[PDB]
Write an enzyme that holds these catalytic residues in place. Structure first.
Site, PDB file in Angstrom:
ATOM      1  N   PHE A  97       0.832  -1.202   0.000  1.00 39.41           N
ATOM      2  CA  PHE A  97       0.000   0.000   0.000  1.00 39.41           C
ATOM      3  C   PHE A  97       0.862   1.245   0.000  1.00 39.41           C
ATOM      4  O   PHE A  97       2.076   1.141   0.013  1.00 39.41           O
ATOM      5  CB  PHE A  97      -0.904  -0.005   1.231  1.00 39.41           C
ATOM      6  CG  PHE A  97      -0.162  -0.044   2.553  1.00 39.41           C
ATOM      7  CD1 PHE A  97       0.177   1.133   3.212  1.00 39.41           C
ATOM      8  CD2 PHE A  97       0.159  -1.255   3.152  1.00 39.41           C
ATOM      9  CE1 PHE A  97       0.843   1.097   4.423  1.00 39.41           C
ATOM     10  CE2 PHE A  97       0.826  -1.296   4.366  1.00 39.41           C
ATOM     11  CZ  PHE A  97       1.169  -0.118   5.004  1.00 39.41           C
ATOM     12  N   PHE A 157       2.410   4.197   1.968  1.00 37.30           N
ATOM     13  CA  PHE A 157       3.632   3.706   1.266  1.00 37.30           C
ATOM     14  C   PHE A 157       4.436   2.701   2.120  1.00 37.30           C
ATOM     15  O   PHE A 157       5.364   3.078   2.890  1.00 37.30           O
ATOM     16  CB  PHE A 157       4.520   4.863   0.823  1.00 37.30           C
ATOM     17  CG  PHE A 157       3.851   5.784  -0.157  1.00 37.30           C
ATOM     18  CD1 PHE A 157       3.260   6.969   0.271  1.00 37.30           C
ATOM     19  CD2 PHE A 157       3.786   5.451  -1.516  1.00 37.30           C
ATOM     20  CE1 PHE A 157       2.634   7.802  -0.642  1.00 37.30           C
ATOM     21  CE2 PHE A 157       3.167   6.298  -2.418  1.00 37.30           C
ATOM     22  CZ  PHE A 157       2.590   7.475  -1.982  1.00 37.30           C
TER      23      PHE A 157
HETATM   24 CU1  CUA Z   1       4.625   1.551  -3.994  1.00 36.03          CU
HETATM   25 CU2  CUA Z   1       6.408   2.632  -5.683  1.00 36.03          CU
END
Ligand code: CUA
Ligand code: HAS
Ligand code: HEM
Ligand SMILES: CCCCCCCC/C=C\CCCCCCCC(=O)OC[C@H](O)CO
Ligand SMILES: CCCCCCCC/C=C\CCCCCCCC(=O)OC[C@H](O)CO
Ligand SMILES: CCCCCCCC/C=C\CCCCCCCC(=O)OC[C@H](O)CO
Ligand SMILES: CCCCCCCC/C=C\CCCCCCCC(=O)OC[C@H](O)CO
Ligand SMILES: CCCCCCCC/C=C\CCCCCCCC(=O)OC[C@H](O)CO
Ligand SMILES: CCCCCCCC/C=C\CCCCCCCC(=O)OC[C@H](O)CO
Ligand SMILES: CCCCCCCC/C=C\CCCCCCCC(=O)OC[C@H](O)CO
Ligand SMILES: CCCCCCCC/C=C\CCCCCCCC(=O)OC[C@H](O)CO
Ligand SMILES: CCCCCCCC/C=C\CCCCCCCC(=O)OC[C@H](O)CO
Ligand SMILES: CCCCCCCC/C=C\CCCCCCCC(=O)OC[C@H](O)CO
Ligand SMILES: CCCCCCCC/C=C\CCCCCCCC(=O)OC[C@H](O)CO
Ligand SMILES: CCCCCCCC/C=C\CCCCCCCC(=O)OC[C@H](O)CO
Ligand SMILES: CCCCCCCC/C=C\CCCCCCCC(=O)OC[C@H](O)CO
Ligand SMILES: CCCCCCCC/C=C\CCCCCCCC(=O)OC[C@H](O)CO
Ligand SMILES: [O-][O-]
Ligand SMILES: [Cu+2]
EC number: 7.1.1.9
Lengths: 31, 166, 551
Positions: B84, B86
């Site tokens: 996902f 980040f």
């Molecule tokens: Cu997640 Cu680039």
């Protein structure tokens, strides 16, 4: 005979070969 | 002279064309090989497995990262990874060495990369779909996951960890 | 211009093309320094204040350099050259239409791009959602090539009307098989834009299936590379031998290369989808095999061209194994630029061949290696070929002369570009081999890739070297474009088309190859066969997903 052409394709082959064999080895190291 | 050179060039080009053809075939042969070995595990299972990105964190095997590791064989573990923005859950993924790890990875937002540094595991992660790859870790320790597919501004800092226990 | 109005149209395609290249390339050195672990973006953001992120710049770079410039170039070359060979005027109304479509589409797409409203990169993979103005503007730009396709098929048929029982002339045959290929090729993206991207960005649908988008995208996604490549080949094949001081060693072998590109350029798109889920491995293998096939025409090309250069070099006095190389017109930038581009194509195609090998892709997929592969291909061979054309094509199109000084600067730009590209190629491949990702602002995580310390240096040097080349090229382009002197004996002088060496051709193959309709159909069948089953499955189980803006 096209001696120069043959040189070029010699280089081309070696490049492909080093490249391909190289990455194959790396693939198996990571396998 | 010009008449002669044409015959010679074409004579050797036919030689070349055949040789390169062989080399390509030999590669094909060498690629076909790898599909027969265990290294082929990293190739995604081609099956379609639709999920719902919007509810994937509320319900399902991705909803409790602490329980995303599941023994599915005598020597096999399925792991439910969420990639996902980040990051990745779980963090870290813990698996034992020598066990076959079946990674089932998906995204709740955008497409991400799942590339396990040091390994052949390198798979695109698509929202709505579960990507399925297989690996057996041969060395214990701490591998890093890298997101190699642009996912927005947090991209360059999106990293994960797999820990392989002895 | 009254006699040849196609000159002015072609001129506009080129200039707008190089404009795209220059603006696109402004971001190059900055990205090079980034893969060298150096953050010079604060500097760029003062210089160009509208740039909000490294990734907005990466979008501008790819779209402008890889999509815009290359296409404009293809449209310029593969319309004018067939037209000059056949000594016939293109449909002028159509030619200005296509230009305006490209310009308008570009300007419309530029709007959200500059405004930070479509920071999605040149692949625009959903669910990354761009501004509708980007998807529309892109669409109108790409479609402009259908108008090009028409024009050349028109010229073609007209000629054949006047010349029944005559085989299609070499350049025109190239350009026909080229365009016909691009039409099939283009159907993927058209479908993706029309069924998904446009409706979605306008609000008409709530989601898009990422897998089906990627699949339809890469339908067009691969052949678009050959779409970039072939205009440079057409020059390398039918013009370069003359500039080199020799002749094309084989007309039939040129046609074969091109024919094989029509047949094998589209049904291979899965090689971008090796690490995609929901695509059967057996289809990934098939495509890989077919991809390996498509490399044959370039392998073939390698020899034919090299032979032609040897012939040229021997004719100019060269003796020995290497003596024909030194005998070539290394003083002429029109010759130097492509030859240099072919040199780097060696490692370039070599890396491509690795990429195609299915499982070997896992080693390199999505790392700096890929960027290293393609910069040798498009950013070197195509770009340099277009660069070197200035020194024969621009005078042909404008009457403006190339001074001696301007020729010398031309050599320099070409050589520095080539060298920077080599240097960068080394740095990226190696970095990719070290697991360094592509599409990443890596100078912003300066402790992340310490193993890549060495290749990083190459990247930096490459950055400054290519900054210099680009700078020199900007100065140099404007020196010739905005030059006071003009000489119409240059504009009326013939295009330096090479002759074909004296060999009884095999008239049989040429004639078979000329049965274009047949080959077009075959090529279509192969696409239905390689893509059909898989798309059938995907449409039967669509799973659309919300868009996202993460910039
Ligand atoms: Cu997640 Cu680039
Ligand atoms: C112009 C544009 C480009 C060409 C041409 C091209 C060719 C190849 N490609 Fe590629 N491509 C791939 C495989 C290949 C293969 C099989 C070939 C082949 O066509 C190569 C054939 C070439 C040769 C076998 C070389 C012959 C050499 C010649 C012709 C020169 C000889 C020298 C002479 C004559 C000089 C003599 C002179 C003297 C005087 C000495 C794959 C996968 O299988 C990927 C995805 C990778 C991944 O994991 O993401 C990929 C990635 C890319 C990307 C990135 C995609 C993205 O943005 O996600 C782009 C832009 C691209 C462009 C280009 N590439 N390619
Ligand atoms: C001044 C010379 C140039 C330099 C130094 C340069 C540098 C770079 C670098 C370092 C990247 C990789 C960045 C990343 O992956 O994050 C890149 C990507 C790219 N380059 Fe260039 N380049 C130049 C010119 C060109 C040209 C002429 C083209 C082709 C016509 C081109 C096509 C592209 C494309 C297709 C991308 C990929 C963008 C994406 O992944 O979305 N380059 N360039
Ligand atoms: C004109 C065309 C010519 C292009 C040739 C480029 C191909 C190979 C050269 C590179 C040599 C291969 C490098 C050896 C690999 C090696 O030593 O392995 C890595 C080691 O583990 C430490 O990083
Ligand atoms: C002219 C400009 C072109 C730039 C050229 C690009 C540089 C990459 C060169 C060769 C690839 C060879 C693959 C590298 C393989 C090195 C590792 C190796 O040899 O692997 C052995 C071991 O089993 C595993 O670690
Ligand atoms: C790689 C080498 C590729 C070159 C292939 C060599 C072919 C030799 C050939 O065809 O030569 C015929 C000649 O007329 C009689 O000696
Ligand atoms: C005319 C004669 C033509 C003969 C062509 C010979 C060339 C290649 C054969 C390929 C051999 C395939 C053997 C596979 C071995 C391999 O790749 O092993 C990797 C690793 O050790 C496993 O764990
Ligand atoms: C052009 C110059 C060419 C230079 C190319 C460099 C290639 C080097 C290595 C790739 C081979 C990978 C070897 C796999 C071992 C993985 C490893 O050591 O990683 C740490 C591990 O994760 C701890 O748990
Ligand atoms: C939207 C603006 C479209 C503006 C397009 C302007 C067309 C001008 C053009 O190229 O057409 C020449 C024609 O003969 C007439 O002047
Ligand atoms: C430029 C393309 C514009 C319109 C295309 C026409 C498409 C018509 C849009 C209808 C889409 C539709 O049927 O909507 C799906 C809905 O979400 C299910 O409930
Ligand atoms: C002819 C030129 C433009 C057509 C105008 C089309 C304009 C469509 C406006 C749609 C828009 O801006 O909608 C965003 C939407 O909410 C999705 O996220
Ligand atoms: C030209 C057309 C002919 C091409 C030859 C392809 C034939 C069989 C593919 C074998 C597929 C095997 C892939 C299975 C991967 C695997 O083992 O899955 C994990
Ligand atoms: C790694 C980064 C380093 C980059 C190295 C790349 C190779 C560069 C050039 C080799 C090209 C060889 C052919 C050039 C021949 C020019 C020549 O023979 O010059 C003629 C002389 O001027 C009388 O006219
Ligand atoms: C170790 C190396 C560090 C890399 C330094 C990079 C570039 C140096 C500048 C080189 C400029 C090359 C110009 C050659 C040229 O343009 O000469 C024409 C020639 O006569 C044939 O066409
Ligand atoms: C073709 C031109 C130049 C070669 C310089 C590259 C040598 C790398 C040295 C370096 O930067 O050091 C890396 C690291 O810090 C070591 O500990
Ligand atoms: C004029 C012709 C000569 C051409 C030069 C020769 C090429 C050699 C080096 C390039 C130097 C550029 C690299 C600049 C410094 C690299 C850097 O930033 O190093 C950091 C270090 O590796 C970690 O802390
Ligand atoms: C044609 C162009 C070829 C010219 C090559 C560039 C000059 C190299 C000499 C070394 C430069 C010395 C400057 C020190 C570099 C350094 O330390 O970089 C600073 C910092 O790391 C980053 O901001
Ligand atoms: O794309 O090659
Ligand atoms: Cu491709």
């Amino acid at each position: 005979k096209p001696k120069g052409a043959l040189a070029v394709i010699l280089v081309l082959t070696l490049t492909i070969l080093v490249f391909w064999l190289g990455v194959y080895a790396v693939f198996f190291a990571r396998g | 002279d010009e008449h002669k050179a044409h015959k010679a060039i074409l004579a050797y080009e036919k030689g070349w064309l055949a040789f390169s053809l062989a080399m390509l075939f030999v590669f094909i042969a060498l690629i076909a090989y790898t599909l027969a070995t265990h290294t082929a595990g990293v190739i995604p299972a081609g099956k379609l497995e639709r999920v719902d990105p919007t509810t994937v964190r509320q319900e399902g095997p991705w909803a409790d990262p602490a329980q995303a590791v599941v023994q599915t064989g005598p020597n096999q573990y399925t792991v439910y990874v969420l990639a996902f923005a980040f990051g990745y859950q779980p963090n870290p993924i813990e698996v034992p060495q020598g066990a076959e790890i079946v990674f089932k990875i998906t995204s709740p937002d955008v497409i991400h990369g799942f590339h396990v540094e040091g390994t052949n595991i390198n798979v695109e992660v698509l929202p709505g779909e579960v990507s399925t790859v297989r690996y057996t870790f041969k060395r214990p320790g701490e591998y890093r996951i890298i997101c190699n597919q642009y996912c927005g501004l947090g991209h360059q800092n999106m990293f994960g960890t797999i820990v392989v226990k002895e | 211009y009254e006699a040849y109005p196609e000159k002015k149209a072609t001129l506009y395609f080129l200039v707008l093309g190089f404009l795209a290249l220059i603006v696109g390339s402004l971001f190059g050195p900055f990205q090079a320094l980034n893969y060298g672990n150096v953050d010079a973006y604060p500097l760029l953001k003062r210089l160009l204040p509208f740039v909000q992120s490294y990734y907005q710049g990466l979008t501008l770079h790819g779209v402008l350099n890889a999509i815009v410039f290359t296409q404009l170039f293809a449209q310029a070359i593969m319309v004018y050259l067939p037209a000059r060979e056949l000594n016939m005027r293109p449909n002028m109304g159509l030619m200005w239409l296509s230009w305006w479509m490209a310009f308008i589409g570009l300007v419309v797409f530029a709007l959200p791009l500059l405004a930070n409203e479509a920071t999605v990169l040149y692949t625009f993979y959903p669910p990354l959602k761009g501004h509708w103005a980007f998807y529309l503007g892109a669409s109108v730009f790409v479609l402009s090539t259908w108008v090009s396709i028409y024009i050349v098929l028109d010229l073609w048929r007209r000629w054949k009307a006047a010349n029944p029982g005559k085989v299609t002339p070499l350049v025109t045959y190239m350009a026909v098989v080229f365009w016909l290929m691009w039409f099939l090729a283009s159907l993927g993206l058209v479908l993706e834009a029309v069924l998904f991207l446009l409706p979605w960005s306008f609000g008409l649908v709530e989601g898009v299936d990422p897998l089906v988008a990627r699949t339809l995208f890469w339908w067009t996604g691969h052949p678009i590379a050959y779409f970039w490549l072939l205009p440079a080949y057409a020059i390398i094949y039918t013009i370069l031998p003359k500039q080199a001081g020799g002749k094309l060693v084989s007309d039939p072998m040129a046609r074969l290369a091109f024919l094989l590109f029509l047949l094998l350029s589209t049904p291979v798109g899965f090689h971008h989808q090796f690490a995609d889920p929901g695509i059967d491995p057996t289809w990934k293998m098939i495509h890989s095999v077919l991809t390996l096939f498509v490399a044959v025409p370039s392998l073939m090309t390698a020899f034919t061209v090299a032979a032609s250069l040897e012939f040229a070099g021997r004719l100019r006095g060269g003796r020995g194994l290497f003596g024909w190389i030194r005998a070539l017109p290394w003083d002429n930038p029109a010759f130097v630029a492509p030859v240099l581009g072919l040199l780097g194509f060696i490692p370039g195609g070599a890396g491509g061949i690795v990429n195609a090998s299915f499982t070997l892709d896992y080693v390199v997929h999505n790392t700096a290696w890929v960027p290293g592969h393609f910069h040798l291909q498009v950013a070197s061979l195509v770009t340099l070929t277009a660069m070197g054309s200035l020194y024969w094509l621009l005078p042909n199109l404008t009457g403006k002369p190339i001074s001696d000084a301007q020729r010398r600067l031309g050599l320099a730009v070409v050589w520095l570009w080539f060298l920077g590209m080599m240097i960068m190629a080394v740095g990226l491949h190696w970095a990719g081999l070290l697991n360094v990702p592509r599409r990443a602002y890596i100078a912003q995580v300066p402790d992340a890739y310490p193993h890549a310390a060495v290749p990083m240096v190459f990247n930096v040097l490459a950055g400054i070297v290519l900054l210099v080349a680009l700078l020199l090229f900007i100065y140099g382009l404007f020196s010739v474009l905005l030059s006071r002197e003009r000489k119409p004996e240059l504009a009326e002088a013939p295009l330096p088309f090479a002759e074909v060496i004296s060999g009884p051709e095999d008239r049989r193959l040429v004639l078979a190859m000329d049965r274009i309709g047949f080959w077009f159909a075959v090529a279509a069948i192969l696409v239905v066969l390689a893509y059909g089953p898989t798309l059938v499955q995907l449409f039967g189980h669509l799973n659309p997903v919300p868009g996202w803006r993460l910039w």
